[PDB]
Design a binder for these strands. Structure first.
Lengths: 46, 271
RNA sequence: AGGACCGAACCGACUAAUGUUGAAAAAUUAGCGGAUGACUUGUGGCUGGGGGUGAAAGGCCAAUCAAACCGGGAGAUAGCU
RNA sequence: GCUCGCCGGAAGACCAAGGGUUCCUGUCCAACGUUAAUCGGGGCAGGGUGAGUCGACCCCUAAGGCGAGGCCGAAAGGCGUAGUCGAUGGGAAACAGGUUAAUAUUCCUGUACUUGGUGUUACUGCGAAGGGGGGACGGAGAAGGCUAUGUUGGCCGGGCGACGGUUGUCCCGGUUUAAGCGUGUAGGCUGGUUUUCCAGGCAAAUCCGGAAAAUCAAGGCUGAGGCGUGAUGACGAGGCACUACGGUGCUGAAGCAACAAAUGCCCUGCUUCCAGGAAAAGCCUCUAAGCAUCAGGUAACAUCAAAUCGUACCCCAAACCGACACAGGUGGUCAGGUAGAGAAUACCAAGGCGCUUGAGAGAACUCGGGUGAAGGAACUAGGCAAAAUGGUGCCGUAACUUCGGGAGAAGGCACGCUGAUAUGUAGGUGAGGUCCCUCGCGGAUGGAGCUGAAAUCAGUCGAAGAUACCAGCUGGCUGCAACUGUUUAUUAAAAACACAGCACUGUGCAAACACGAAAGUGGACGUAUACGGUGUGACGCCUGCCCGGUGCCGGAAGGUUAAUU
RNA sequence: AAUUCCUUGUCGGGUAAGUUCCGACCUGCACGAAUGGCGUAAUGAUGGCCAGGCUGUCUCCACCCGAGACUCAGUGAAAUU
């Protein structure tokens, strides 16, 4: 049976990449929240 | 001509075709072609604004001259071609200077005929002149509502208009819908009528034929739930309310003309 | 010529048995329907929650839908256990 | 190591996506592996990925994204021009053989090709963000010419039989060779050359388009395969000796013909139909502003350069998506033999596997199958399930009907093997020879060789000859929906939803209508034979009476009536 | 009647025997003409009924071939309390 997760690197970066988050005001707030919490990985870039 | 298909299969029993052996059998004129991508009835917001649109065959756009502003240069007709963007046919005309253009095909036009435009052109079908130099009671098509903008009325397969009277700077015309409207006596018009009067006799014959045109199926409204349409549902078939659109408008006589900038050019609405 | 006919690939899911702490949070075995078309499939794109999409079942929108998920108002209120 | 069994349009081989050392060698057995384990995709250590030609990067653009100014909006922000990004598409060039425990069209041997920089020489109108050409495009169908590939003969090497026969019409194996360069065939398309003139291609133009004459009858473009060369080479069954019995070295025969034949190539072709079938650059060509003893352009020769990143391994699966070493899911490419219409089905080749607990016993009962006396639906809500029918040719076939159908209606007969007609027939393919020629990949004649249906007659074996796998049960009456289609992913596939057709009604274009505080966008680059909404639902015969109520569409005397004053 | 409560209405056909099925009658509880009426060839994994063939569906079960169940060795769960 086909499952929900079908990986694709190109689509992953275009949806949750670092540059995608920096292109919108709300996206930049996501980075600020994660920086405050001290996350070791901010995005899914690598 | 009109030909009825034989009933060799369910789907061809009720099919009626319109065939014209005079149409060109080949590729169109490349220099007058353009790209034309489909939209699916969605606007720049990505939302559906016109329902029942989607799919169909790929099409290319032909540039048609609706202005006819080449005066004093006779042109000859080369061939008649099929146009998928409109119900009427088009013709390729070659001018003396060596230019080519597309025009709507009048009723009795054929290869070898000559056409001209201006104020000194002869009164023959296919010629374009300002309406001030057209005898009253004549039949014309491709009429402009403003001098120089281009033809906008009577452009369908077999439509035409008739000049009724001329008082001053304006003239009175009777449109195909029966409306009586007046326009300035400077707009150009073409003699004759559009030459595809048999286009109304076609019968698609099956659901698939409509899908080729890009028309998607229509859901009535009594078959939905009340959360989707005012006609809603019920145990069985009830429909105990006045007919109404989605969004709540009557649809059985209610008028929806609220311009108020026109009506100085309307004489009799219609009917 | 054909939303034509028989029938594999391919796409579907009408009947029965098994399974039901299953091999599997919907599958297996034997039959079954369509199979040049309103067909099917790869890659990328667009539509966002009282909104979308819907050949229309209140269907589907990440195993969740008569109003998704996450955080917040928040220790909502509970004449009831 | 020897037998046995299984897959073989895969359970074989090569990739993309995804994963990220799972690849190779040595070593270890605690944990991990549904058992043991000396073994492992497990632990530890070392080793392994070599490119001017393959891919990315790069040049060009589609849907779409962002968007200097700009327009709009309480703020945030929205839309969009010039531009700039974005493949799933377009754009230069490498083939064969050999080699590592693990990489190769990348290393080695042999033989090739493409695009640029610089220099020299000869001859010279070069020049763009502009014009034109080209690139450049659909579905279905048909025939011919070919190759991949297979079969048989010939040729070369070897063999004479564990049990009757086997020196012949006997048995086994091999019989392979590229890119490039030269030739330009089957076949497809288009008449060619010269002079003069012109409201068009925003300016210009020798280019494109158009007009009027002269002069000739063959010029040009595209094009699979074959042949020659590449090749006195490479490869090659078998041998001869060394050999830590892992394998290392030298040598080397034949290497031809006929027939059959694709879903691949000629073919982006040809014929035909209506639903009428991307864009831009590279490339070719003409000129403007400019520069002309320069600069640039064409040709030959020499020389230099072609960077950077990916390259191991799995990839229908134990390595990817499913919590698992999980009977599930996952796109592209390659396509042998016998029988067969076939990529179905059965048995096999190359190749790969026996699925990570076994050993005994032969109770009830459960699961998956085989057979059955007499009866034959008496079973049951219901013929649920099971049994049965099943192929090709010929004969034959009802009511009804929209004249197409119904129809494979129903039903009946014949099917193996051997010989003859004919030492292999009809047909297909086609050598030698001869004749002619503008002699060439030519034409006519000619028929050797090879390949090979179907039918008739006679005979013959068995209970059974469409013998296995494979492979329609049929007929009669009737409700509903015309029909093919669509739907509750995971208890409902239907009489429900679509549907062609029909009617009413709105809409004159800055259209009605819809998404948006707005700008704007869709409707539509459409114009009443058009578009939106509503009901009905092929087709045939038809669709009656009622305007008091509610709604909608008109009317104007009078009554009542808001802000304001 | 996909519509009929009384109702298994009455008559005829089919069966040895038919609350279903087919054809008529009209007392239509409570059909009816585009939320359409009455017909209709072809089509349907659609609802109801009757035949031929066929059979372990059944009278009524019997035997046989395989995988479990049972015994031995290794590993080693669960609901509940």
């Amino acid at each position: 049976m086909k499952r929900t997760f079908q990986p694709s690197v190109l689509k992953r970066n275009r949806s949750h990449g670092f540059r995608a988050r920096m292109a919108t005001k709300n996206g930049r707030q996501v980075l600020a929240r994660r920086r405050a919490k001290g996350r070791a990985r901010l995005t899914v870039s690598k | 001509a009109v030909v009825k298909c034989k009933p060799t299969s369910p789907g061809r029993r009720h099919v009626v075709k319109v065939v014209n052996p005079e149409l060109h059998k080949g590729k169109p004129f490349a220099p007058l072609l353009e790209k034309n991508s489909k939209s699916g009835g969605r606007n720049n917001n990505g939302r559906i604004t016109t329902r029942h649109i989607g799919g169909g065959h790929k099409q290319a756009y032909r540039i048609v001259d609706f202005k006819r502003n080449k005066d004093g240069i006779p042109a000859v007709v080369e061939r008649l071609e099929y146009d998928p963007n409109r119900s009427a046919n088009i013709a390729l005309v070659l001018y003396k200077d060596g230019e080519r253009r597309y025009i709507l095909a009048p009723k009795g036009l054929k290869a070898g005929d000559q056409i001209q435009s201006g104020v000194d052109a002869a009164i023959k079908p296919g010629n374009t002149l300002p309406m001030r130099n057209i005898p009253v009671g004549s039949t014309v098509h491709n009429v402009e509502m403003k001098p120089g903008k281009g033809g906008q009325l009577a452009r369908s397969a077999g439509t035409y208009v008739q000049i009724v009277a001329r008082d001053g700077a304006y003239v009175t015309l009777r449109l195909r819908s029966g409306e009586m409207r007046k326009v300035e006596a400077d707009c150009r018009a073409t003699l004759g009528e559009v030459g595809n009067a048999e286009h109304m006799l076609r019968v698609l014959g099956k659901a698939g034929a409509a899908r080729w045109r890009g028309v998607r199926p229509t859901v009535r409204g009594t078959a939905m739930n009340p959360v989707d349409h005012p006609h809603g549902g019920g145990e069985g078939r009830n429909f105990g309310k006045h007919p109404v659109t989605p969004w709540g408008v009557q649809t059985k006589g209610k008028k929806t003309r609220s311009n108020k900038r026109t009506d100085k050019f309307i004489v009799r609405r219609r009917s």
